[PDB]
Design an enzyme around this catalytic site. Structure first.
Site, short mmCIF file in Angstrom:
data_model
loop_
_atom_site.label_atom_id
_atom_site.label_comp_id
_atom_site.label_asym_id
_atom_site.label_seq_id
_atom_site.Cartn_x
_atom_site.Cartn_y
_atom_site.Cartn_z
CG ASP A 96 -1.89 -6.35 2.23
OD1 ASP A 96 -2.62 -5.51 1.65
OD2 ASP A 96 -1.82 -7.54 1.87
NE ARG A 149 -16.98 -16.69 8.69
CZ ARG A 149 -17.72 -17.67 9.17
NH1 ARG A 149 -18.83 -17.43 9.86
NH2 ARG A 149 -17.35 -18.93 8.96
CE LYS A 189 -5.78 -6.38 -3.78
NZ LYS A 189 -5.48 -5.30 -2.81
CG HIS A 221 -1.92 -1.09 1.23
ND1 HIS A 221 -3.28 -0.86 1.25
CD2 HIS A 221 -1.78 -2.44 1.23
CE1 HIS A 221 -3.92 -2.01 1.26
NE2 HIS A 221 -3.04 -2.98 1.25
CG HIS A 265 -9.11 -3.88 -1.56
ND1 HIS A 265 -9.99 -3.61 -0.54
CD2 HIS A 265 -7.96 -4.28 -0.98
CE1 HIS A 265 -9.39 -3.84 0.62
NE2 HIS A 265 -8.16 -4.24 0.38
#
Lengths: 238, 569, 260, 342, 238, 114
Positions: free
Chosen positions: D248, D224, D105, D24, D107
């Site tokens: 990331d 989760r 990408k 990023h 996303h």
């Protein structure tokens, strides 16, 4: 002692925290920068000591500064202090939320709101639809998702919801837990009403003629609650 | 339809019409005058928010599809305090209003179309202002530029050649060769830059040569000799070449008094530094020129706001700036000041009344480069505490005062130096030099700086961190600050003559090069919210300033806002 | 009604430094007062300039000066420029200067002439304390006003009290009151057409009355005289049309005192 | 010969520079940090600390791509930029690729819908560029099966193949067994430690831009994540089910810790399960090669730059890292960039 | 804690001062850098405490270091220490002059001057002129200002001073207080004697013919003491 | 200040705010919704009118000086029916509002400089 830029930054932060601690010992009420630096430096030192866990440090960071140790407005300004600390088991992000209790005297940048509710989607009539999640996982639907094309594990009358979206605050979402049945309010999609993307069930202008094509596509792709006639007449483009 | 609580709505999207927000820790309250958004269709970016493919990002965008959109920003500008989305395209402000997807939302203009080529910037709960314009910059060191940039200033107009004594005293870049030096050094910095030439010359050829070499105006400084002949010749050449003239008048009254200086000016547009006098021999009578139409008056940082410690540092600052040795009897005797607490106090009240139109620094020469905005808002807060709400306020808010004091450093210097076509306000068609503030830190520490449509400076945390927030957070250069991106992001202002002669190709400049215009036909009436022309009766026997008969004064502030709550040092 | 944020004070204490020069041991000044480092001319005494960062004393100004010269200090205290008393509308400008000279210390207090403007009300109170061995050369020049623009005795009132004590015993008293409203200061006994008046006091200085008289006589453009007070210390009173002859006479007397 | 400079590598390990493919581009200060960590190639997206960049690895549009490409001239690092794949417009996707992106990408924060996946994969097959995906957390349009149907057996590079707490978890781990999926795992969840689970919710909320003072955003921020999945991630890395390790950076991941966390995972797996059965000797050479490929040659192959970078081979560019064996994996001795010490 | 570059610089300065203080406690005689850092850091800390004013800090900075606490020459080298400190009422510049008394042993860069006076403007004869300031403000005239063109509120025989400047050290100035009458010495301007600028009364070569034009211009513009004949004959260029 | 009859004002300068005009011989009546002019500063061209050198034609014009100005025009547009001066520069509509000389009139923007 090969020092990385991260280590140099952390050294600067530690000594800012040391300066803040010395001022606090002298009895100067800390400002915003000093309070943040003090909390961060203390967390870093505790993690280096390595006798505490990240949860223990998150708890302990909220006890460092009393409301009388900081200037007015500092507690309001400081919402959370994050700091990446090197534990015996690697680098972890310790986040301390509301480390200082607000005194309430001065609130920098405070909002003076009217006591009147905001009416969203004004002039749009909402219909109610019962939705059951027959899948095994919860499903979240955004305020602007075309509700006709939601997860096929959701069961509802899709014909009623063609061309509609949830009538909630934009940016919020509605969660359907598995097995749970909810009633939602739907409003017509505004603007040009051109539906593109989503599950590629419409990919065109949303009108009654595209409704039949969308229903047939949904029935073919197995979307629950989508009812299309068995004797469906195809068009030249669909 | 549905109704949600205003508290929840404001938490989600920021304040809407009729909502008030306190500016920093000051006493100033800004009220949202109107809102461009349509309730229930707000643009939000996030996990399951609206700025997604097909919902608010168009799959068939208009050809004017934005490059960047700032969502739900509270625009604070001299044009009004309102709530809108700011669209940026090709380095300009493409549109202000309701952005989004025309296919799924109503009331979306073609110039605010969000598409697959659009980056999103969440301005909810954030104030957007235009970048500051500092017009008194002594280019003593290049380290001033990042300091001003981090303070929230995006344009610097000034002069100098580094820490020479001429630069330490004056805001002057003298000569074609020194102008070339400064213009070629300007390629390094992330800041719009403009350079002033030496006006202290009775040689029209020399003055014109400097203008054609690329200066955007003249500076006539007492340290190079502020004589009526020099004033006259510089104003003649500047009227010929359409460039501003700024003046720092003669302290010693060697050639004449304020009346003689005004006679030399002869009712031509002139931008005055230290219109309060700053202890000069023209003080306090030079304050009288702040009532003339042709004078655009500016005041410096150190004397605003008037505090308990204001008068203590003035003599040291004056001596060091004017290069008088403190170990020499002759220089100490020469260093005679006519400064008075009455004048220092009257300066703040004149700012409140709009008699003074521009605030500036005079960086590192009796003034602090990173404190123009902070001291402007400290003065505004002090005046609000002293005199209460202005009579021009049309509501239970300080919107008029906010706009006046914001114009003091955003649009008024831009008008004064002829760059208001490009910078100075958040308007469609202007270059996207925007500052994002959080309202808690408004006026002291910006959240981020957008330079030419790309983020140039931002508060950033640890580079090795898993999120941008964790400490240490400080101001770091972003991608618009580096490489060849800064050439596209930044502007060098030159005169129209230099622009026509092709200064950019001649000097090999890679920055955008733009000509200044409309510098000679502006008066005090053209300043926004600060166009008050009043006969200023100055009694020098009593050092008493009166406007429309009433005497003006203020009390020293024992404690100012935005000072110690926000800074470790 | 002090217009300054804080009270105008100037506490100065000078002593002999390690290198043998006269240094400032301590100093505390609020506006408009300011103190720089002492100046050391090649042959003269150590010079200290009492800086006043102001165009002049205005209404409500109340200055409190406290100078303390330590033992064996040879100090000449001057001012930046002429002290001008501005138009004090309803109030007045007051200066209270207390000086303490130590043993074997020489202080040459030579401020610039005082120029009162129209409707100026000034109250000066100087109290000098000396030891037996202390030497003092005090001076004060008062101008009738802005003479060159025909502003003669247009001020409200000038009160100046000087009290010089030696070994905590009074040795000199002076009470100069100039009130044009009560009497014409242009008469034959007050100024007699002169505009500048110099009052000089030499205490324990090693200069003879004959020498001072010769200096006064050879000084041109000045109608002056010198006598001995009760405590056997010299007092010089001079009148002149301009401040240049008075300043020249004062510097001549100072040089005669210092050359000993 | 006389034109040769000498560099003493005796007692020094030489590896290829790291390749971080999840960058990023939030701040340029990440680049020197990764460089000092031993990463010489950064493939990612972003336009500075915009919220779109904070959430996603995307440089959207021709103009923003030009901005980033011209800013890239400043840095000492090989750089590659990914465009926005979340668009049902073939013209827009092709325009980004022609503007200079090396891939797409897709996303979730820009909308990961099956239509967008399909269109992006079509355009990428046309233009021979990689597609990376960060799948839909909310199951809004469908589950992992629907996402895989949209992919339709085309080469796709998956971020957070363990799910990272998304609604596709833990079933999204199933795609790590497919041939067409190149799975990558992020720094924060490897290796599984005592403090791993504590920071996940804060990182998730800040990365996805959900206000922690808003009831609606807090309720929306449902994870989760399970310690079972976090622990299974390390074992899958050891077995070679996960092929790429990445950061990331500053969005749930640390840019200067890709190599360090890869070797921490390798060491932890060695301590737990012992020597791999593939070791042909009394050494850990096979494990070393597997975990080194995880961040050197596998991302290069995934993004189509293995002809230039990724390994110490003749003909490749000289992007080399010199380590002392005592400091291997944490602090390099020096970096050789393009044949010169950088 | 958004830190500005100024704050980072001040943090470095504070910790340099802390190092100097620790060395002083250890008993090491401070050098130039240590002394300056110690004084600056102490002033900054006092201002942050906020119990003192700028004047109090200026006084207090001169008491921190005794002459025996520093190496030889440090006191001579340190003339004044300036520091911008953040008070409760904003940032103010505190200047401490001669913070340390000179011991006199070693003087770095000291001058060994001859005992002979410098004769300036040698070979130029000076005339004396009486000048009265009839204005309301003091007027300062530089050594090289053309004295004929000085402030018109100064009254003197301008004809005597045409083409002349003050006979003082270059860079010094003479001050005329309002109402005060002074006598000054004037010497001829050297070089080409071309007067340009000033009050634009000459703007040409200074000779007897331009003297008449300058006098007429000064009389027209109201310069005091400028006497021009009533029956003035104009030239072709003037 | 002075007040003149609305009939005389309209004859001199055309209808102002609140005035209605019939469109052709039809039955449609258009009402002037708002007016950009400042009363008493209207631009007029003629013998001794205002559009003269130094009065409404600037002697120091802005760099955006108009090529053509239409004075006192009743603009009928989908954006509104109002009264304004239309400035044309370089073939485009440079500005709509109050045009004239900034030296002698108030409320004259740079893009409407005559």
């Amino acid at each position: 002692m090969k020092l990385t830029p991260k280590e140099l930054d952390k050294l600067m932060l530690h000594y800012a925290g040391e300066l803040a601690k010395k001022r606090k010992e002298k009895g100067i009420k800390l400002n915003y920068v000093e309070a943040v630096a003090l909390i961060s430096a203390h967390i870093m030192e505790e993690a280096r000591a390595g006798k505490k866990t990240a949860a223990e440090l998150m708890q302990e960071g909220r006890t460092l500064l009393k409301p009388d140790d900081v200037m007015d407005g500092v507690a309001s300004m400081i919402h959370e202090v994050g700091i990446e600390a090197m534990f015996p088991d690697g680098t972890k992000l310790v986040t301390v939320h509301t480390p200082i209790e607000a005194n309430g005297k001065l609130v920098p940048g405070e909002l003076f709101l009217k006591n009147e509710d905001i009416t969203i989607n004004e002039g749009k009539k909402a219909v109610s639809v019962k939705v059951k999640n027959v899948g095994d996982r919860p499903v979240q639907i955004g305020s602007h998702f075309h509700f006709f094309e939601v997860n096929r594990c959701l069961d509802f009358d899709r014909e009623k919801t063609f061309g509609k979206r949830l009538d909630i605050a934009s940016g919020t979402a509605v969660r359907f837990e598995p097995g749970e049945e909810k009633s939602v309010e739907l409003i017509d999609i505004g603007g040009n009403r051109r539906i593109f993307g989503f599950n590629a069930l419409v990919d065109r202008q949303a009108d009654n003629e595209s409704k039949k094509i969308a229903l047939h596509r949904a029935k073919e792709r197995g979307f629950h609650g989508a009812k299309s006639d068995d004797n469906y007449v195809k068009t030249i483009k669909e | 339809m549905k109704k949600i609580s205003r508290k929840e709505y404001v938490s989600m999207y920021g304040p809407t019409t009729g909502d008030k927000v306190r500016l920093g820790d000051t006493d100033l309250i800004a009220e949202v005058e109107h809102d461009y958004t349509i309730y229930g269709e707000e643009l939000k970016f996030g996990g399951g928010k609206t700025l997604r493919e097909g919902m608010s990002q168009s799959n068939n965008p208009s050809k004017e599809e934005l490059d960047l959109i700032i969502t739900n920003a509270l625009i604070v500008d001299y044009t009004g305090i309102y709530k809108a989305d700011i669209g940026i395209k090709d380095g300009k402000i493409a549109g202000i209003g309701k952005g989004g997807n025309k296919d799924m939302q109503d009331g979306v203009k073609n110039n605010l179309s969000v598409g697959p080529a659009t980056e999103a910037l969440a301005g909810e709960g954030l104030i957007v202002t235009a970048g500051g314009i500092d017009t008194h910059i002594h280019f003593i060191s290049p380290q001033q530029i990042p300091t001003a940039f981090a303070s929230g200033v995006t344009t610097m107009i000034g002069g100098g050649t580094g820490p020479a004594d001429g630069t330490n005293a004056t805001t002057i870049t003298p000569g074609r060769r020194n102008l070339k030096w400064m213009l070629r050094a300007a390629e390094e910095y992330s800041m719009n830059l403009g350079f002033l030439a030496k006006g202290n010359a009775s040689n029209d050829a020399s003055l014109a040569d400097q203008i054609e070499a690329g200066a955007i105006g003249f500076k006539i400084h007492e340290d190079w000799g502020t004589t009526p002949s020099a004033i006259n010749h510089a104003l003649d050449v500047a009227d010929k070449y359409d460039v501003q003239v700024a003046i720092h008048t003669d302290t010693l009254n060697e050639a004449g008094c304020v009346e003689d200086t005004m006679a030399a000016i002869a009712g031509r547009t002139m931008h005055t530094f230290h219109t309060e006098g700053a202890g000069g021999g023209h003080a306090p009578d030079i304050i009288k020129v702040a009532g003339e139409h042709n004078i655009l008056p500016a005041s410096t940082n150190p004397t605003i706001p008037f505090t308990v410690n204001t008068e203590a540092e003035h003599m040291d600052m004056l001596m060091v700036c004017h290069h008088l040795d403190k170990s020499i009897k002759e220089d100490v005797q020469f260093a005679d000041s006519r400064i008075r607490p009455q004048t220092i106090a009257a300066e703040d009240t004149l700012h409140d009344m709009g008699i003074f139109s521009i605030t500036s620094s005079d960086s590192q020469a009796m003034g602090r480069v990173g404190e123009v905005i902070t001291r402007t808002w400290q003065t505004a807060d002090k005046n609000k505490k002293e005199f209460g709400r202005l009579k021009e306020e049309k509501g239970d808010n300080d919107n008029f005062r906010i706009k006046r004091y914001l114009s003091k450093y955003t649009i008024n210097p831009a008008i004064a130096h002829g760059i208001s076509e490009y910078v100075g306000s958040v308007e469609v068609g202007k270059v996207a030099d925007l500052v994002l503030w959080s309202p808690a830190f408004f006026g002291v520490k910006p959240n981020m700086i957008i330079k030419g449509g790309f983020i140039a400076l931002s508060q950033m945390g640890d580079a090795n961190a898993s999120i941008p927030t964790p400490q240490p957070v400080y101001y770091r250069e972003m991608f618009a600050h580096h490489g060849k991106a800064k050439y596209d992001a930044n502007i060098t202002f030159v005169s129209q003559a230099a622009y026509d002669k092709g200064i950019k190709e001649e000097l090999g400049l890679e920055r955008q090069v733009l000509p200044v215009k409309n510098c000679r036909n502006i008066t005090k009436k053209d300043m926004q919210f600060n166009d008050t022309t009043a006969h200023i009766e100055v009694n020098p026997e009593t050092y008493h300033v009166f406007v429309d008969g009433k005497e003006v004064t203020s009390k020293p502030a024992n404690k100012v806002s935005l000072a110690q709550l926000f800074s470790i040092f | 009604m002090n217009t300054y944020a804080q009270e105008s004070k100037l506490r100065l204490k000078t002593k002999i430094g390690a290198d043998g020069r006269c240094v400032i041991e301590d100093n505390f000044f609020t506006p408009p007062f300011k103190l720089m480092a002492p100046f050391y001319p090649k042959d003269d005494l150590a010079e200290i300039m009492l800086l006043a960062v102001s165009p002049g004393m205005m209404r409500g100004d109340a200055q409190d000066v406290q100078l303390n010269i330590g033992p064996n200090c040879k100090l000449r205290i001057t001012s930046q420029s002429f002290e001008k008393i501005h138009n004090t509308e309803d109030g007045f400008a007051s200066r209270d200067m207390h000086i303490v000279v130590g043993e074997n210390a020489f202080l040459d207090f030579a401020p610039f002439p005082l120029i009162p403007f129209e409707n100026a009300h000034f109250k000066g109170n100087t109290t000098i304390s000396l030891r037996s061995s202390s030497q003092l050369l005090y001076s004060a020049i008062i101008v009738a006003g802005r003479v060159a623009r025909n502003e003669l005795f247009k001020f409200n009132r000038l009160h100046t009290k000087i009290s010089i004590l030696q070994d905590e015993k009074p040795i000199y008293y002076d009470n100069t009151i100039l009130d044009p409203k009560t009497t014409d200061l242009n008469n034959m006994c007050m100024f007699d057409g002169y505009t500048h008046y110099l009052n000089l006091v030499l205490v324990n200085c090693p200069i003879e009355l004959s020498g001072v008289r010769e200096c006064i006589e050879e000084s041109e453009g000045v109608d002056g005289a010198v006598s001995e007070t009760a405590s056997s210390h010299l007092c010089v009173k001079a009148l002149a049309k301009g401040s240049e002859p008075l300043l020249h006479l004062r510097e001549k007397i100072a040089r005669l005192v210092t050359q000993t």
